[PDB]
C-alpha cells in the first residue's frame, strides 16, 4: 500500500491472502466475512488478458497473518478452497465491472483473537456512510510504489471518499454504480493509495452508529499508483450485496 502506515497486531482480523497453490505464490488480497466465506476482486481469479483462469484447486489462503518475514504458528491458518464464485455479469472485457467474487473454504476457520469476520453494509449504513469526504481504511501487502517493493508487515492507510464526478473524470474508463473511488485530491495535504497486489483486499469503515467495521468496497483497480489527479476505484460492496447472498444461501 502506497504511502501508508504499518498495522497494529490484529487490526484487520478479517484479512486474507490469496495464494497460487503450486508454485506457492502471492496473488491478491481478501476479506473474511464469516467462518466459511471469503470476499475478493473478480479479476484475481479471472483475468484472460494476463491469461489468468484459476479453479478451486489452483489456490489456497492464509488468515490472520501480520508479517511474512516470519510465520506465526498457532496464529495464522491456511485453508483450502471448496469452490470459487465469480459474479456472472462480471465485465473483464470493458471496465472490470462487478469485479467481485466469493470463495468457499473446504473447512471453516475458527475465529480466534487475530481472526474475525468483517461486517457487510446494510442499505441503511451504506446510504449514510458511503459519502464523499468520509473516510475508510484500505489494507494489503501490495507494492509500496509504482514500477519490486514488497512489504514484510500489513500496510494500512486511510483515504477519504471522492465525489463521483471527480472520479468519473479523473479517468477515461466508464465507471458504474458498482464502483466508487477514494483517495486524496491534488492539493489535499496527504497522499496514500493501494497498488498492485492490494486488489481484492478490504476497504472498511467504522460505523458511528453501532461502532463496527463494515467492508464497503474491494480494491479493484487504478491508473498507476498515488499519482496526483488520479484516484483508486473500489467495488461498491453494497451494490452487489444482493448477489453475495444468493450465493451464500445456496452454498
Amino acid at each position: 500500500i502506497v504511502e501508508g502506515s504499518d498495522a497494529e497486531i490484529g487490526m484487520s482480523p478479517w484479512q486474507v491472502m490469496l495464494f497460487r497453490k503450486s508454485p506457492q505464490e502471492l496473488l491478491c488480497g481478501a476479506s473474511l466475512i464469516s467462518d466459511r466465506w471469503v470476499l475478493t476482486a473478480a479479476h484475481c481469479l479471472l483475468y484472460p488478458p494476463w491469461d489468468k483462469n484459476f479453479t478451486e484447486n489452483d489456490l489456497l489462503v492464509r488468515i490472520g497473518k501480520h508479517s511474512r518475514t516470519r510465520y506465526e504458528r498457532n496464529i495464522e491458518k491456511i485453508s483450502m478452497l471448496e469452490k470459487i464464485y465469480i459474479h456472472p455479469r462480471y465485465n473483464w472485457r470493458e471496465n472490470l465491472d462487478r469485479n467481485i467474487a466469493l470463495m468457499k473454504l473446504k473447512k471453516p476457520v475458527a475465529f480466534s483473537d487475530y481472526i474475525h469476520p468483517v461486517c457487510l453494509p446494510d442499505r441503511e449504513t451504506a446510504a449514510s456512510l458511503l459519502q464523499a469526504g468520509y473516510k475508510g481504511r484500505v489494507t494489503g501487502w501490495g507494492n509500496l510504489k509504482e514500477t519490486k517493493g514488497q512489504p514484510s508487515v500489513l500496510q494500512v492507510v486511510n483515504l477519504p471518499i471522492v465525489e463521483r464526478p471527480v472520479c468519473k473524470d479523473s479517468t477515461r474508463i466508464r465507471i458504474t454504480d458498482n464502483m466508487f473511488c477514494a483517495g486524496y485530491k491534488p492539493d489535499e495535504g496527504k497522499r496514500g493509495d493501494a497498488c498492485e497486489g492490494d486488489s481484492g483486499g478490504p476497504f472498511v469503515m467504522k460505523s458511528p452508529f453501532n461502532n463496527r467495521w463494515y467492508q464497503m468496497g474491494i480494491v479493484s483497480w487504478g491508473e498507476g499508483c498515488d499519482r496526483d489527479g488520479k484516484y483508486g476505484f473500489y467495488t461498491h460492496v453494497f451494490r452487489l450485496k444482493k448477489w453475495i447472498q444468493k450465493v451464500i444461501d445456496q452454498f
Binding site: 476482486a41 479479476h43 497498488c195 480494491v219 487504478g222
Partner: peptide, 9 residues
C-alpha cells in the same frame, strides 16, 4: 512509457 494506463491491481 509515456502516459498512465488503467489497470487492475
Amino acid at each position: 512509457t509515456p502516459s498512465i494506463l488503467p489497470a487492475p491491481r
